[PDB]
């Protein structure tokens, strides 16, 4: 049974990419419009970093201790390697998206039942010649909606 509060092994973890027009965050749970990527070998999602800005002051009553605040948080870079397939329409769309090069939205779904949506642009297309695999990575832009917002 798919439900949170228990850990999940993560067998399925599907990956979908948007094709239509609308608001991706309006309802990510419906897969009526998005196209799935098939037989991904491995995946590494991006990490949400931040930036540290100085806060120390002359008249600050506590000295001998640095003071730093947080600002300008940024999304990370997503990467995944799958089986190189020049036949399926998904990889065709992926390479057309890279060549034309526009920001697009996509999502990852977990066996637990919650979905994560990012938006960004792709920046690399790798290859290997021993059991042919294609490695592709994208860089995100703007705010991604984490899976912990839909649960509320």
């Amino acid at each position: 049974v798919p439900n949170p509060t228990m850990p999940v092994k993560g067998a399925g973890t599907t990956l979908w990419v948007y094709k239509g027009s609308g608001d991706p965050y309006a309802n990510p749970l419906s897969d009526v419009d998005w196209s799935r990527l098939a037989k991904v070998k491995d995946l590494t999602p991006g990490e949400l970093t931040a930036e540290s800005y100085d806060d120390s002051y002359l008249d600050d009553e506590d000295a001998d201790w640095t003071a730093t605040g947080q600002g300008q948080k940024s999304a990370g870079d997503t990467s995944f390697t799958l089986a190189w397939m020049p036949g399926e329409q998904g990889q065709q769309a992926l390479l057309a998206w890279f060549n034309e090069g526009d920001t697009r939205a996509y999502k990852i779904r977990f066996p637990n039942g919650t979905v994560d949506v990012f938006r960004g642009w792709v920046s690399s297309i790798g290859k290997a010649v021993t059991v042919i695999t294609r490695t592709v990575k994208v860089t995100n832009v703007g705010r991604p909606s984490m899976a912990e917002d839909r649960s509320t």
């Binding site: 100085d54 120390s56 002051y57 002359l58 008249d59 600002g71 300008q72």
Partner: protein
Amino acid sequence: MKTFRWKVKPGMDVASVPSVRKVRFGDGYSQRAPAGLNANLKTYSVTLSVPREEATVLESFLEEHGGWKSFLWTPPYEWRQIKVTCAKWSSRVSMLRVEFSAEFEQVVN
């Protein structure tokens, strides 16, 4: 007379050039005089960094005095409550915080 209670970032600079009556001769013996009574007047270079919300407030306060009105200010940890006027300030608006670089010239009442 208003005051200046904003905090100041590290790196504030202090300059001091007291006024003397130099006059040069053959082999030294350069006679020296203290010139005026309060000859020296420290000049401060002050850097601040505030989020954009109150940048307008700080700018309005500095504009209200212009470059002709004095206001009390206490240099950090220094034993004097000096009166200072400013005529040069700039701000670097980037995305979230804006840093002000200003110069403060000391003046007697």
